[PDB]
Symmetry: none
Subunit: 216 residues, 4 copies
């Protein structure tokens, strides 16, 4: 369906203002005047915090803003101490036996660290070399801002047919951790050059390449 184009996590420094945008089509969000922005303060009941454009229900606060920028719907939060710490959802109204929601701009800043992802790439074992099950597993410990873009490449170009990514979590301090792994035939492996696991941030990134070969 639609996508209502939303960055992943917006990560300020308390006493801040962010803009979350929401691109759709030109029809809706563009011409159309009905955008809605809700808040799931750690999921559950994402409340309507913004409706119409910059309109606001009653049992929702101030500090809370939003515009219909001739093609992008944007919410501007301007404070953010112990308010934005929510999942944020942008929704586009329209008359098609539907009405659009977008992707999840989640907010926080309450943590300690906004330190980086720790990735490693464990290319296939003997599960693969013998057991013939070609699994390269790409791992990410010690996060702080839990945001995991990951993209794999197959020798040069994108790769993504039989690859999974474990929605993330990590205890102890919290931080965050997660995985992404790919499973195919041996050869698809040993016949092939290299696999890349690049988790991404904005002012973050880390890339990694595992390549085929031999034993002792």
């Amino acid at each position: 369906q639609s996508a209502l184009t939303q960055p992943p996590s917006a990560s300020g420094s308390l006493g801040q203002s962010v803009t979350i945008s929401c691109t759709g089509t030109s029809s809706d969000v563009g011409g159309y005047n009905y955008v809605s922005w809700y808040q799931q303060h750690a999921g559950k009941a994402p409340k309507v915090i913004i409706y119409e454009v910059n309109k606001r229900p009653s049992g929702v606060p101030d500090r809370f803003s939003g515009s219909k920028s001739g093609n992008t719907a944007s919410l501007t939060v301007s404070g953010l101490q112990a308010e934005d710490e929510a999942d944020y959802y942008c929704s586009s109204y329209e008359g098609s036996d539907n009405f659009v929601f977008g992707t999840g701009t989640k907010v926080t800043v309450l943590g300690q660290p906004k330190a980086n992802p720790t990735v490693t790439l464990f290319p296939p074992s003997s599960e693969e070399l013998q057991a013939n099950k070609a699994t390269l597993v790409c791992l990410i410990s010690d996060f702080y801002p839990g945001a995991v873009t990951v993209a794999w490449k197959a020798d040069g170009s994108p790769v993504k047919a039989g690859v999974e990514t474990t929605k993330p979590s990590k205890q102890s301090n919290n931080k965050y951790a997660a995985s992404s792994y790919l499973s195919l035939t041996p050869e698809q492996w040993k016949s092939h050059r290299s696999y890349s696991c690049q988790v991404t941030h904005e002012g973050s990134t880390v890339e990694k390449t595992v390549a085929p070969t031999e034993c002792s």
Copy 2:
């Protein structure tokens, strides 16, 4: 506060029919209509799936209605389909632009086969150990239920303050499984005798010890 009464949890089969009950004030669901429901599954953005009272866009197969007796507004999926089970929610106009919604349900639907669990662990590359440490990662690829525990054993005894786990899953509408990680350097590693991961799951315990696999 404007809450929408609805149970926190639903159950059923896939042979008969399920009904979630969204109840409120005559204000919201008494003398007003405009009860929309959304299909959310923790991570995709909620889907309008009965609007007004029982009006439904491509997504309602058919007997996936809702109607509102008095102010007790129940949506029924007649039949029931092996979907994923999580959150359904109802919002009504409660009028003066201040929409409100009942939370919950989720589901307990037989008609999805329990699975058994499939492990992959990949401590290696084949240097890892001569030069530093790498780290041990265990991956249960799958098994339906999502009700488990993993331990790791160093030739017979659990090592300690040397373990990190937590997640249920991802997948699409398939299963639930996660991955464990221990840092064990070299001798911490092999000096360690040999390592099984111990997947105690639903009365069946499964597990793989790994020793000399070398390079894959």
Copy 3:
């Protein structure tokens, strides 16, 4: 033969919602409509209670609908009301004047309070015994569940080939209880020491012995 698939038994509460599923050939419920349902409770004459597919005359409060996904035509009572529990049935035109109907359901609805049982036995008039026999009759007036047994004891020991019982009930939408009868003449009577009726019911046993009551 033209049968209408529907479960033989339904269950639920009175807090949520129940759905009975009437499924058949596209002939009946595929490309034809005209699925009517009747509320029968073993003794009153069945009541049309969703006609065509979800059209309903005074009797449907409201969310007491039915809809037909594909040919799986489910009727939902949203809410559910402490009714009596027994038979619901669906008939569709299956066209060429040869209507057909699914049988069953009945119900298992919490939301009706179990009762305890209340006995009355009346062997007498006050001559009965000097002149012939009369007969012993025991009446449990009531108690909700309807899951029991009655014995009769002649000062401690069950007499034999001297007993007749069987029934669940009547009442309106209240309870279930019945009445026992033993013919015991005179001496067969008092020569008999004294008679308790023994109502073994749902883990609680209740019972009344009767001796000298004389005339009432």
Copy 4:
């Protein structure tokens, strides 16, 4: 609602023809041309055996008849060996968010005896004279044709406010048995003259009177 006026049990002698009638109003059954007559061969799925007037589905037999006698709807069964042994239901179509069913003319003849009801009347006990609970219980053993009209009178005239009648049954040979009892204050009892329990057949009847009074 309606009543669709139907005698209770029609009781031939095999190789016979009976007429079951169905009076309603003048509107329906009268003018109206839609009567329907179904068969519950010991309950469950009462099939449509007659529709329109004398029209008959396909998987139903011959021997089976029915007319729309300008105000009474009648079915004439003409054979009856091992066919009529059913509950029989007369139904009147009409356009009032309804469609009428009538009362239950049940059929049989397969038995041994078409012998009479055995009634007794156990007027209040000490439950009543002391316990102050005024219960006169009217009992009917050894039936063959299970048909129990019962009517109580209070000194002369009808009586029926707090009186029950246990839908009937009896094991051993079968036959049939049942009860009917009345519960009121002592005085309503001892202040009052007499209570009558008349079970009725057609070419049957039995009447019984219990009157108030004293002990030893």
